[PDB]
Every structure is written in structure tokens, then in C-alpha cells.
Amino acid sequence: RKQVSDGVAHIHASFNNTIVTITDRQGNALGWATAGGSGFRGSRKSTPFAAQVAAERCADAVKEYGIKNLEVMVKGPGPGRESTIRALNAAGFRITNITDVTPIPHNGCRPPKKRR
Amino acid sequence: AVVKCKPTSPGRRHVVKVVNPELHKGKPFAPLLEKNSKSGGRNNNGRITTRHIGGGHKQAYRIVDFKRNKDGIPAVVERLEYDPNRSANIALVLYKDGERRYILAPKGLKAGDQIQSGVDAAIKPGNTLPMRNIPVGSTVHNVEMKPGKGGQLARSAGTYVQIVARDGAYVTLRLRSGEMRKVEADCRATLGEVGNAEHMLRVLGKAGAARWRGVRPTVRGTAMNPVDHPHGGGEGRNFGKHPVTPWGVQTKGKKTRSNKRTDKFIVRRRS
């Protein structure tokens, strides 16, 4: 539970769910909180408010570390990629940058066929 | 090439032959032969220890230079030859000092090719050199498992081992069975795949083919009596038993490797 200053707030925002894991600058995770664990089961899980709540609930359990400044790594589509940043800053974290880490292939693997 | 025999008679209908027109159509090199008497599968005690062996054609043993420990001296592949002991063909080579030696014939080895061995050799297929001077990822054959041992991996026809990793004293090798094995990097390895890569396409046509290759018939366990085999008995094709070897041990899936002294080398096992 040692004190660290430079943490990174990784956000795996997707369509159904969003996952906000806060790691140190090497990738050791401090704490995580998803939209599905904060209540919000089903359609609620996929709203910006659920991601806001998840980012708030992850700004806790990382208080034992004294995190001051944060790198935000938004990864993926979905509504919980611009509300989670606002909720992380409304928690008292000075943001150092915002970086989109969404995996973009270069025509690599073939996607699922299609819904219908 | 792969030649399919014409069905001018049964037992000739289903044959497929591998005619290698580059093999020497003459007597092999004499000073490198020695007699190889058949066994029948019978051990020191006269008893059959491995079944389904006996008969077949006479064949002399060709002294193949598996070690390739004549470093620095170049060699010219004088002749390609048929070996009755291997599935692959052998290659009589002549060194620049006047010494003839049988080697395994890699894929790209025709007559007159210039090979050699040693720490400073090139990376042409057929050139032996310890697996430190060999670049990683390259395709080698006739790999040694101990330095100076002689070479034991990838020496069947069309077979090769691949150098996957290289960690200090050791090298990881994807073997022809998919298993990744660590051998020390002082061990030698000839470059390129082994020749006669179409050997697996012959289909032998008939029973006498296997018979003169030296393979006595295989009686199914069910075709026996309960005293003869764990399978057997039954008033007409009854099995009802779990498949086992003639000595009781499970077959059709039961891992029987118990070495516990070479497990330090097997990074990961057969698929």
C-alpha cells in the first residue's frame, strides 16, 4: 500500500461495459472499478452515468496511494470515455494528458460477420 | 519423382513409387560399407523383444558421417546414393585432402556441390557448424543433442529442426514433433532440410512390399484368444475392453514418458 505519485488511469470503455483501472507508470494496477459492479446491470451498464460512477468508485481504493497526477488512457468506443475523464478530474486528480489507446488494426484479423 | 504404377495386375495397381533419377545406378562406395545382419527382433536372449520384424532384403551398412567433425576442409558432393538403412538418401563427398565420406543429403544437394564444416563455414545448405554461428530461425538438420556426440535430431527424410530461441549456453529447437527442446549451443547442426522429402508418398501397393522391407504381419489383439492377448475371446468380434498393449498397459492415450532427468530440457511437449 506504498505511496506513489505518477499513476495512469486506464479506461477500457466499450459499448456494453466500461472498466477504469488505475495503474502506476509501469502497469502495476492499484485499483479498478467497472460500471457493472456499481449496480447498473443491463442497459444501465452502457450509459455515461455508469462510467462516471465507476470512475468515482475507482478514485476510491486508490486513496491509499496518494495519487495526484494521472495519465488518462481512453481505450475503445462507447459512452463511458468522455464522462469518466470528467469524473476522474472531479475527484481531484491533475491530468497530465489524455491519450487514445484504442487498438486500430491495419487490416489484420477478420471481424465477426454481422448482426441481422 | 512420384510415379504411380499402372494397374496391370492387383498388387501393382495401388503402387506409387518415388523414382529419384539422380541416385547412383551402381555399386556404392566400398570402403564405407560394412555388413548388417538382420536380427528378427530377437535380443541377446534369443527372444522376440520387438514384434513384426524379420526377413526382408539383405542390406549393407553405409558408414554415414553423422558427426561432420572435419572442420575447415571443403568437400565436393561426388555422388548421391540410395541408402537402404535410412529413409533419406546419402551423399558421398570428397574432401580436398582426398578423403571420401558419406553424409546425409539435404534438400538442395546435387552432385558437385561445395560443402564444408567448422566454426567459420558459410550458411549454405549442407554446411555443418555449431549452433552458435548459425543464425536463429534458420532451418537445420542432423542436429546434435550433445557436443561432439554425432547428431540425432532431424535425420529422417524431408525432416528438419528449427532454431527458435538462443539463451546464453543453450538453444531452443522446434523439433519435427512440435516439441521445443533446449540443447547446448556447442552442438552441431547441418543446414537445410533433409532430402528425399517425397519419401512419404510411396504407398507400397501390396503386402510383399512391407514383407521385403522387413515387416512381418501384425495380428490384431482381437483375432487372438484370451490367453494370448488382453483382447481376444468373444463368440465373434467381441471387444468390450479398454484398448491395451499385449502386456496390459493402456494404449490409445496414456503418457508413458518417465525420464525425470531430461525434463529440464523439454520447454514444451508434442502437440
Binding site: 468506443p77 470528467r86 491530468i95 489524455i98 491519450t99 484504442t102 486500430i104 471481424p111 465477426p112 454481422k114 | -
Partner: protein, 65 residues
């Protein structure tokens, strides 16, 4: 898209979710979602080409405005 941070936050988050559509990522992962068969690729491209040919050079009308 590594938007380093200036002071006022959505003075910079604005240039984050305005650079996201300059790089067009949140709409680039909508083609990569499902596999669109090459016929449909070509057909959608051709229909976008034909739509782009909306004759904006034909807007000299009165319409009593």
C-alpha cells in the same frame, strides 16, 4: 492522440475530443466492428460517390423566397 495537458481542462479535453474526429478513431472502430463483404464495400463506396455528386451547381432557383 497523446494530448498533453494545458491548464484549463476542456480547453484541452476539447482538443482531445476534437482531435479524436480529426483522426476519426471513434468512427474508425465502426467499420472494424463487423465484416462488410467486399461487394458491400464497393457498393457503399459507389453510393457515397454518387451522393457526393449532388449537383450544388444547380441552386439558381427562385422558389419565391
Amino acid at each position: 492522440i497523446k494530448v498533453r495537458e494545458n491548464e484549463p481542462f476542456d480547453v484541452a479535453l476539447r482538443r482531445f475530443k476534437r482531435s479524436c474526429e480529426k483522426a476519426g478513431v471513434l468512427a474508425e472502430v465502426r467499420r472494424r466492428e463487423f465484416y462488410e463483404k467486399p461487394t458491400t464495400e464497393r457498393k457503399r463506396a459507389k453510393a457515397s460517390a454518387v451522393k457526393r455528386h449532388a449537383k450544388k451547381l444547380a441552386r439558381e432557383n427562385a422558389r419565391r423566397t
